Design a protein around this nucleic acid. Structure first.
Ligand SMILES: [Zn+2]
Lengths: 89, 344, 62
RNA sequence: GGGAGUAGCAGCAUAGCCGGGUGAGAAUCCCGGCCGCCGUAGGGGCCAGGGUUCCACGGCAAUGUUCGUCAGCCGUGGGUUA
RNA sequence: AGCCGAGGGAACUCGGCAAAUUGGCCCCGUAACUUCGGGAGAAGGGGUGCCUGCGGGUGUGUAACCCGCAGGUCGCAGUGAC
RNA sequence: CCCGAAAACAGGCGGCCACCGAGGGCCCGGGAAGAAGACCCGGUUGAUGGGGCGGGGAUGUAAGCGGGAAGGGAAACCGACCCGUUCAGUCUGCCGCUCCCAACAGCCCGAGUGCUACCGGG
């Protein structure tokens, strides 16, 4: 899969879970979507999201999260388990 | 008292999900032309044309507006011949012969294909079938067919079907079949331009629905709307008989029903995705493609009006079993315009 | 098979579409879409909108 | 006992998320930040009535409409000066 | 519990129940009848934003609060939401 | 025309396994299907979802920069709005190309015994 050291740009589509959820619960769902998307695509078993990504998502409230996030993903190996660290771009 | 007709038809009951997605043809017409009595394809989209009216009735000889459904039809592969005999009640299968070299993707539907089965054995089995058909124990002959979606890029898992042949005799039918097995059929070899067709398919799914939408029940008065019973019916029945009858409108599955439609005129059969008007060659695929269906590549039919089903669904056409006495002619009507503009 | 011309945004639109509006004085108008018709009867000026042709006809008069 | 592992734990103020910790154990306990409700009252003060409910340390059998390492709950020791 | 609905406009119903219409301020103009106090906000009509400016009242006031007018311009809509 | 092998004479044909293993389910990526179940297409013999590149569509010409503007002020300068850069910018629950990321790793159900009374070969 993606090599540990090298940092990759991913674009997370949040437009997908919109209309799956009530309007007032879209940002809390978008967070979990980011987590799962990044885990699946990095083949990671743990994920660590930044306060900057969170504050980006909640920039406008609980009703209008961005339709596409653009994140940088860098991976670490510790005890034979992959761990992603997510930042903005 | 006051009278009105009942709400809905009892002729399409039980209104239940279809046993299969591939439709089923129960009856076949009386044709003399020895030919296959049908074809199959995949539905692409709708558009409109303008044509000079050929059909009887005022509006004949004028320029009118005609909506049109495009049906994509790659060739079929004929892989089987199947005989039927007469039993105590009705027909019953008697023998089958298959072709030996079949595509690698047919095992996506028929997992258990034969192992040795070379041409030697194929020809021997054919001979047995012929020596049986020349005896007299035979009642009719049919062909076994499969589709080839790999050509248009739609899918790989194919569809398998059984079609009939025209004529009062069986040895002419066997000659036709023996000539056709192992090869491909194109729609121009079978269907004519101007025929009336019956279309057969499975309709779109709507889900579980209530009686207002599923049977045409009238919404109730605004006081009942404020009481909690607007989209409900009033009565499940009387006191005696002391049970609910099957004729009382209830909720349940709406859509995904096996339907048929009569007398849809075939207007044009095209080749390689283009329509050659009298003057010049033209394309049918609109700007930006069809919504929910891409570009048309192989072959296609223009059908007058509407047909049952969603876009990428499998359709089956046959020549009309219930035609009128005043038929329109069999020839491509004069077309003056075809819409290629964006349909999305 | 005549291609008709919108009286709001000036473009040619295809057979089997659009609208004709008739006034009680016999004058006629053609409309390609719901938008052009609504803007007309609402009172908007197509001469300020860069997606019409009245815009170029005015660009001249500048 | 069956009803039944069902109804109800919606409606009048729809609120939580990221990071860190403590711990056998954390949707719900603590710290930070983001996002939000009230805002001539859901803020601030004080009668009657209640009577220790106040405070700190230690706990989780039971109570708390869920969990709970929390608590107006349980244990020990304190606290009201004209 | 709420938002919009083409064309018709109470044909619905015991019944125009429910919903919708109107809506602030300035100016003009306002009936029958009357216990001459009222009716009366009767009714009916026009206007209303932003910008650039000019004047008036009280006041020592290029402090403060109020009152009139012209011109330019944007929009389907200027008590633009409440 | 619609339903229909639970039609108790509980059917007919073709083919594959049994006398390790034919087939099937879970699982993964999605919807043309959907209250749970079921159904359909795909799973590296690969364009199923995302991305990037382009096509088509919806609104209606972005910010910044430059010039003008009723009128005001000694002058510098204010100034609602207008023109140009600009069929622009933003968006796409639509199509196409392209293996750049992910459809991996696997796990379970599974027919398989016989007798007299026999039918037609041995
Ligand atoms: Zn127009």
């Amino acid at each position: 899969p993606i090599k540990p050291g090298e940092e990759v740009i991913f674009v997370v589509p949040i437009n997908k879970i919109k209309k799956r959820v009530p309007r007032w619960k879209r940002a809390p769902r978008a967070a979990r979507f980011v987590r799962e998307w990044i885990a699946r695509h990095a083949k990671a078993d743990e994920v660590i999201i930044g306060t900057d990504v969170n504050e980006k998502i909640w920039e406008r409230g609980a009703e209008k999260p961005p339709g596409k996030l653009r994140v940088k993903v860098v991976v670490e190996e510790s005890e034979g388990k992959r761990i992603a660290r997510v930042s903005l771009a | 008292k006051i009278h009105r007709p009942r709400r809905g038809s009892l002729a399409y009951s039980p209104r239940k999900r279809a046993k299969s997605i591939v439709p089923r043809i129960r009856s076949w017409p009386k044709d003399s032309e020895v030919r296959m009595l049908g074809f199959a394809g995949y539905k692409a989209g709708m558009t409109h044309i303008l044509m000079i009216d050929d059909s009887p009735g005022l509006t004949k000889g004028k320029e009118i507006f005609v909506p049109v459904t495009i049906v994509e039809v790659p060739p079929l592969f004929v892989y089987g011949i199947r005989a039927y005999k007469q039993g105590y009640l009705g027909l019953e299968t008697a023998t089958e012969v298959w072709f030996h070299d079949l595509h690698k993707n047919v095992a996506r539907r028929i997992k258990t294909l034969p192992k040795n089965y070379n041409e030697e054995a194929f020809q021997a089995k054919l001979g047995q079938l012929e020596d049986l058909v020349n005896d007299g124990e035979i009642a009719d002959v049919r062909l076994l067919v499969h589709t080839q979606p790999w050509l248009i890029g739609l899918k790989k898992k194919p569809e398998v079907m059984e079609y009939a042949i025209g004529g009062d005799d069986v040895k002419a039918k066997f000659d036709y079949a023996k000539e056709k097995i192992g090869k491909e059929l194109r729609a121009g070899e079978v269907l004519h331009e101007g025929e009336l067709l019956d279309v057969i398919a499975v309709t779109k799914g709507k889900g579980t629905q209530g009686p207002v939408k599923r049977w045409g029940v009238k919404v109730q008065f605004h006081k009942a709307q404020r009481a909690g019973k607007g989209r409900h019916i009033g009565n499940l029945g009387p006191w005696h008989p002391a049970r609910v009858m099957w004729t009382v409108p209830q909720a349940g599955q709406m859509g995904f029903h096996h339907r048929t439609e009569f007398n849809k005129r075939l207007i044009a059969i095209g080749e390689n995705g283009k329509l050659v008007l009298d003057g010049n060659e033209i394309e049918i695929t609109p700007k930006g493609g069809f919504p929910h269906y891409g570009i048309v590549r192989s072959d296609f039919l223009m059908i007058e009006g509407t047909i049952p089903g969603s876009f990428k669904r499998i359709i089956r056409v046959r020549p009309a079993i219930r035609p009128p006495k005043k038929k329109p002619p069999v020839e491509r009507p004069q077309i003056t315009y075809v819409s290629r503009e964006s349909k999305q | 098979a005549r291609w008709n011309v919108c009286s709001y945004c000036g473009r040619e639109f295809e057979p089997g579409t659009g609208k004709m509006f008739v006034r009680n004085d016999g004058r006629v108008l053609f409309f390609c879409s719901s938008k052009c018709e609504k803007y007309y009867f609402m009172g908007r000026n197509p001469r300020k909108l860069k997606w019409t042709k009245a815009f170029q006809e005015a660009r001249l008069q500048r």
